Enzyme design. Sequence first.
Site, mmCIF file in Angstrom:
data_model
loop_
_atom_site.group_PDB
_atom_site.id
_atom_site.type_symbol
_atom_site.label_atom_id
_atom_site.label_comp_id
_atom_site.label_asym_id
_atom_site.label_seq_id
_atom_site.Cartn_x
_atom_site.Cartn_y
_atom_site.Cartn_z
ATOM 1 N N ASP A 149 -11.728 5.123 68.256
ATOM 2 C CA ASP A 149 -13.121 5.284 67.855
ATOM 3 C C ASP A 149 -14.042 5.336 69.069
ATOM 4 O O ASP A 149 -14.985 6.136 69.108
ATOM 5 C CB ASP A 149 -13.530 4.155 66.909
ATOM 6 N N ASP A 204 -11.749 0.304 60.071
ATOM 7 C CA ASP A 204 -12.114 1.711 60.008
ATOM 8 C C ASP A 204 -12.335 2.127 58.563
ATOM 9 O O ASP A 204 -11.465 1.936 57.711
ATOM 10 C CB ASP A 204 -11.015 2.563 60.644
ATOM 11 N N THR A 238 -17.956 6.661 60.068
ATOM 12 C CA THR A 238 -17.275 7.077 58.851
ATOM 13 C C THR A 238 -17.477 6.103 57.698
ATOM 14 O O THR A 238 -17.117 6.433 56.564
ATOM 15 C CB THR A 238 -15.783 7.256 59.118
ATOM 16 N N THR A 239 -18.025 4.917 57.958
ATOM 17 C CA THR A 239 -18.422 3.995 56.902
ATOM 18 C C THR A 239 -19.869 4.214 56.479
ATOM 19 O O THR A 239 -20.177 4.213 55.279
ATOM 20 C CB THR A 239 -18.234 2.548 57.367
HETATM 21 N N1 LIG Z 1 -24.688 -5.018 68.445
HETATM 22 C C1 LIG Z 1 -25.244 -4.428 67.363
HETATM 23 N N2 LIG Z 1 -26.433 -4.844 66.884
HETATM 24 C C2 LIG Z 1 -27.000 -4.268 65.812
HETATM 25 N N3 LIG Z 1 -26.444 -3.252 65.135
HETATM 26 C C3 LIG Z 1 -25.251 -2.733 65.507
HETATM 27 C C4 LIG Z 1 -24.568 -3.310 66.669
HETATM 28 N N4 LIG Z 1 -23.422 -2.624 66.817
HETATM 29 C C5 LIG Z 1 -23.373 -1.690 65.835
HETATM 30 N N5 LIG Z 1 -24.463 -1.759 65.051
HETATM 31 C C6 LIG Z 1 -24.758 -0.895 63.883
HETATM 32 O O1 LIG Z 1 -23.673 -0.872 62.956
HETATM 33 C C7 LIG Z 1 -23.634 0.409 62.326
HETATM 34 C C8 LIG Z 1 -22.211 0.777 61.932
HETATM 35 O O2 LIG Z 1 -21.380 0.824 63.085
HETATM 36 P P1 LIG Z 1 -19.794 0.602 62.957
HETATM 37 O O3 LIG Z 1 -19.556 -0.416 61.870
HETATM 38 O O4 LIG Z 1 -19.272 0.319 64.343
HETATM 39 O O5 LIG Z 1 -19.190 2.036 62.533
HETATM 40 P P2 LIG Z 1 -18.910 2.486 61.015
HETATM 41 O O6 LIG Z 1 -20.277 2.752 60.439
HETATM 42 O O7 LIG Z 1 -18.050 3.713 61.172
HETATM 43 O O8 LIG Z 1 -18.180 1.323 60.393
HETATM 44 C C9 LIG Z 1 -24.234 1.389 63.319
HETATM 45 O O9 LIG Z 1 -25.150 2.256 62.649
HETATM 46 C C10 LIG Z 1 -24.977 0.540 64.328
HETATM 47 O O10 LIG Z 1 -26.370 0.854 64.291
#
Ligand SMILES: Nc1ncnc2c1ncn2[C@@H]1O[C@H](COP(=O)(O)OP(=O)(O)O)[C@@H](O)[C@H]1O
Lengths: 518, 522, 519
Positions: free
Chosen positions: C387, C53, C86-87
Amino acid sequence: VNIFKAGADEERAETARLTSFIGAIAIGDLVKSTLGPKGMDKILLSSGRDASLMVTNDGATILKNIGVDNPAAKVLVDMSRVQDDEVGDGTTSVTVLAAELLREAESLIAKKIHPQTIIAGWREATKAAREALLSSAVDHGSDEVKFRQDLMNIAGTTLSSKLLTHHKDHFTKLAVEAVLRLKGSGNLEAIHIIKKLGGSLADSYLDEGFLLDKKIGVNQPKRIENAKILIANTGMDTDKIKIFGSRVRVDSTAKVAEIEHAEKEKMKEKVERILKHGINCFINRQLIYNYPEQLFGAAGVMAIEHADFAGVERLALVTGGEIASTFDHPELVKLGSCKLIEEVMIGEDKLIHFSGVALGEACTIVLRGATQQILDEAERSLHDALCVLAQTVKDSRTVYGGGCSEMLMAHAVTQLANRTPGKEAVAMESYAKALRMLPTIIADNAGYDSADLVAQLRAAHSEGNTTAGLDMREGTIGDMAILGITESFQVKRQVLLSAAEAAEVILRVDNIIKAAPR
Amino acid sequence: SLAPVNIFKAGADEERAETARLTSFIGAIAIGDLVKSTLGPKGMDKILLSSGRDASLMVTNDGATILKNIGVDNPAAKVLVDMSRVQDDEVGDGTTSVTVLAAELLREAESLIAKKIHPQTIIAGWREATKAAREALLSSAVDHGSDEVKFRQDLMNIAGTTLSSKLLTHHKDHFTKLAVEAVLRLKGSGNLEAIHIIKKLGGSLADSYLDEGFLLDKKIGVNQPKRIENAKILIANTGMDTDKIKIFGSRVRVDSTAKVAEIEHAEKEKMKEKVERILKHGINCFINRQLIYNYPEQLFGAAGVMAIEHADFAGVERLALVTGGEIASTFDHPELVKLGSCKLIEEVMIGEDKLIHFSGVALGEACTIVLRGATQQILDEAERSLHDALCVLAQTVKDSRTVYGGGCSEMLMAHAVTQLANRTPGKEAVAMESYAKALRMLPTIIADNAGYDSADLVAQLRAAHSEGNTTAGLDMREGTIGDMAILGITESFQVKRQVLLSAAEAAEVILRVDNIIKAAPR
Amino acid sequence: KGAYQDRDKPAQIRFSNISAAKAVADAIRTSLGPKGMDKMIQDGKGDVTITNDGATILKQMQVLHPAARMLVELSKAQDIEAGDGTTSVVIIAGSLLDSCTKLLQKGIHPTIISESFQKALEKGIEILTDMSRPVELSDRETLLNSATTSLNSKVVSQYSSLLSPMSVNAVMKVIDPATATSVDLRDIKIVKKLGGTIDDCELVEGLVLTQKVSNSGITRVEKAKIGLIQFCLSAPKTDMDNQIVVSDYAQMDRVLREERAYILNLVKQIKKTGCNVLLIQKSILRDALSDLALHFLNKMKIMVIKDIEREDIEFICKTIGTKPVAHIDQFTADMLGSAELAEEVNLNGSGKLLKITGCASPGKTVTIVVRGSNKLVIEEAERSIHDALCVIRCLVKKRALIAGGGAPEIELALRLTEYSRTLSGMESYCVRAFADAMEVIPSTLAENAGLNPISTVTELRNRHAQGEKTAGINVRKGGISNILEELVVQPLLVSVSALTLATETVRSILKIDDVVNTR
Ligand SMILES: Nc1ncnc2c1ncn2[C@@H]1O[C@H](COP(=O)(O)OP(=O)(O)O)[C@@H](O)[C@H]1O
Ligand SMILES: Nc1ncnc2c1ncn2[C@@H]1O[C@H](COP(=O)(O)OP(=O)(O)O)[C@@H](O)[C@H]1O
Ligand SMILES: Nc1ncnc2c1ncn2[C@@H]1O[C@H](COP(=O)(O)OP(=O)(O)O)[C@@H](O)[C@H]1O
Ligand SMILES: [Mg+2]
Ligand SMILES: [Mg+2]
Ligand SMILES: [Mg+2]
């Protein structure tokens, strides 16, 4: 991330000019209290070894003695020393003018004006002011009485801001007379200043001949009429043959006795060759040993031992002889002449008095005060006066003092500024304000209404009366043509140019990088 | 005192010369230069970072908190900081302007003293000059209030010009009216505590709003209803937790346990009787000031009436103002206590929290403003700027006289000082001229912060005010000279008068010290 | 030819703030997407966490620079408003501050940059809103896809088959999808106990207690009648100072007899209502349970539970349906909750739990119990489940859905650069910098996945320039393809809030021109 060193730092912003401006203003404020006829001098005391104490008024030695830390202060001190070397006057004036230029510079940069704009404005303003000062310069030299009066006025104005003001009427002419004995030779070392304590400072006098701080030998006479002086630079000591590698390698004591007899005989023959010139006086540069002294005493001449390079040079100038080293041909360049070699006592000491000298090309000034500090200050300020008198003898152009020249050149700067557009005009107005800040300071140290006097001078110079300045013995606006507060044109021109150049070089720094100290 | 005998102490010193005024002037100018870069609508705010406990960090633009938080050591800086705090307390804004103007006055004073003029002459000249500036500002102080629409437009202009120098300017057109509305709900009562600013993270700063009712950040009971229509709210300040008899020295002294059981049953009986007396009022929403324990909570839940517990004094006063109730402590006479009324007291979720929402309140005497920004520093700055706007709006509601802003009013009183100086003799004239220059320095600083030709604009305004145009100032949106009547850059007259007078008097008191004597520290 | 701006201190302060923000951004840049790995934080004390997170990473990592503190506050604000992304928000803020330092080097006033950034924000909100599609609740497929997309970048990705359906069940079992407009996450109680593996997480519609039953004779109750108690079952004592004086030998026997009779009367009054299990509230200053009282309760074959926190009574009442009782006379069966079963469950020797299952009045409340080997994975699973719940909350708040995998920000970068090509002036450079400053998210999605970033971003721009929208980076295929076919979506609120908060934070940071160290 920091990259320099431990102890190395960098000020790359308003901090750099802050430090430079505060240092230059500190220099200016320290030096400011020593301007004009009413300025008051200072005491310099060393916290280190020997705890040297010196009472001084001029800014050159004040700035050179103190240990400045801010690099801008070093710039100002170097400029003051260079200006003292060049002419010998206006060190305090140039330092003060540079300080006010930097003060107006920080005031301008507060109004968000690029430093190069100020630089261009200052260049134009100093060009106009230099042109105006040159146009307003009066010249003499063809005249005889008028030029002598001008020299007296220059000596008076140079010597009125120092301690000898207390007896200024006595001293100025004396200084002039000394320069009048140089006969146009730019040789200030021809002037000897002998300082002996005791008696009032009004007992100082320029001698009618020369004074030597040496001693007669043992058997030589101590008084001569119609002297025929021979000045030499020979050995008269053991006097090795100079062929390194020469030694006596004999097998008996009789041989070395003979060799030492031969050495004494060669010394005797050298003394005979010296005496063959037809002399009754003899001045040597280095030591005279016992045998030549005995021979001189037997012959009936007068010998001087250990008169250094300066001594023999001054004797040659004041008497006309040549510095002899080899006496093979006495018929070549001849001796000097005098009329009396009496030994005269001053205080508790005895000095050889060369009176009735053939040439006046060198002379001695006897300084006699009541305190060693008074002697030192009298010597330094007399040196300044003699420097200025020699400089104006070399170049007789003069401009009026008391702020009149400064007022007129500031007026020219103002007139130029009024006809120039852009932000240059405010730069030249600041230049004129800084330039007019000098007579303000002179009046302040005097203690008068500075603003009223400066306003009166501005009005008088704008009207057209180009000979108006500060009459300080009464504290009003007077005529420097009638009054006679003159000044050397070279001194003022050098002050202006040096101050403007130092201000320009200091103003265009935007980064100070200090390396780690040793 | 530099004498070869030292008398003060090991740590106490005295500066009895130009050294003292040197230190005071450099300290005051340092404070002024610190505040200088936060003037005008183009000013940029600063970061205040701690060096210790919890490392408090705050982003702020107003100079009051900047001077309060930092630790000054020069006594002149202390005088400036107290000036700023007093000026903030008096009206609400102008702290930056008053500090800047006092610093510029002291800089001009040091420049004057550099010309060897006695400080009492400067003080007398400044007294005359500030009298002239007072007269000029009062003469130019236009007034509204008889008209209705003109006064409200003036209020909007004042809010806009007071909020334009802070962060909230980024949504000026949305916020100013908000502030105005808040003050317009107070009905002339200068009680800023009726304004409650709830700050919660999340959402852009444009999502802030003034509610159409009241918001309370408390909790409902357990079995109480969570939504009431057409309530009759009774607000109370009773204990109703244990209800000590308040006769100290009373105790139970019995020879059996059944007696103690009966006494505790009687205690619960008196609790029930008090709750029944409360319910006799014919109410359905009860608001307390301190806690409500489990037994009265159960009684309220069985009755079917809401109970808000532990609302501080501010809470009960604000609910009384916004609903119309009466703060009660005894309930012997239900016919003498006046009960407030609302329309809906449902729960509303904002951010991640639940709040009680009194909607359709009987009176709008109190209200709440919800601030929702992106960062805690943004929330703090928004709250401070809104507080300044509300303070100024309340002040101008109290006194409707207004003067034109943007530098016009200070320019006109500077021109009046100049005209006064042009007809006075002696060294006081230069002091009056220095006063006028220091007063004119403020629009110069505004333009400098903006990034315009300060000298050209100030000369233009000097000419405009000398000719006879007394409604000319700076147009920031393009950086020119404009007519403030058309632009409507208004300002509260009391604020400007307070700035002028406080700065003048504090500069006068600082200017007349010739000895700083520091006792040894603790 | 213009203001000199002598003071270079504000420019140095702005450059320092931008550099610190960029450093914070690219510190956690390696923790983005389904291929970015989580960090390990060991604070000053002997505490360690393994977290992905962004909000928790930034909170635990106690930063020093003021801009870093602004960024951590921005991340926590985005967590409050959205709960996911949030990242990406802090990455965006740092990236576009890094882009604007070049603008500051080009001689552009900070106010102009801020206003142009606001205008680009206003255009981008419209772009994102038009790009999305409306979504209707009660559609299990889209909810499951959004929950899986939220969980993919977490450690519990391999458990997404068991956590996504329960994550959506938790939300759907609290609100009525007809008229909700929001969800309160307080009634989703998360209970953690050590032991087991992540695969043994469970969802219960009943109630879970960490307390232990006072009497170890009954643990399983069928058709239980639960009743909360807020009074104390001990010897009577009045609020005012209490004293019992004895002056006879019969007084001692009498006082003991009265105490016993009073306790037995209270217990009989409790029992005669049909109460089958008792829930005693935690009462300081008076032992809520005495040895005599517990003895009598156990004699009447009842289950007694004590030490219940005052803050949980609302949750218990909303869950099982009881009503608090603070007086004996008010204790009746009309205000007595009922359940089908009450059990004391042992988790294979790794603790004990109380489970109330089959409440006849199922309230809007469910509970989640998590299992794990060590504490760290349990905490990370809790954060991931939270989340996912926040993602479903955002989807409930406003009904709009967008593609993921770098598609939204890259499409916005395009549309905004052709928007900048229509605003020639001083602000054209600033708007173009904003447009090209959000290519960082797709670049890092490509980088963390092992793909070549430059070629991937070039292909992304080319394919969204050809009208083939909803195209992004696929890590399963190992290339670039349509994202909705890959079942990767996220609610519009996440991205829109991230962009708005990032732009507001940067516009606030860009107004700083000095820093002062308070005492
Ligand atoms: N299976 C996936 N394939 C491609 N992109 C993904 C996938 N899952 C999440 N993402 C991308 O990762 C980005 C960040 O998501 P995440 O890391 O879960 O939350 P945070 O940004 O809070 O760390 C999102 O913008 C999303 O578009
Ligand atoms: N007697 C005088 N009357 C008026 N002005 C004078 C007098 N003496 C000196 N000044 C002015 O004071 C200035 C500085 O003089 P001074 O202190 O002698 O300089 P320095 O210390 O370099 O010798 C000069 O420019 C000169 O014009
Ligand atoms: N939009 C604007 N245009 C011109 N002048 C303004 C504008 N907004 C504020 N000012 C002026 O800026 C001055 C300073 O206000 P501000 O910066 O808020 O600090 P303070 O209110 O503490 O003086 C005020 O006197 C006001 O007249
Ligand atoms: Mg001189
Ligand atoms: Mg204000
Ligand atoms: Mg996510």
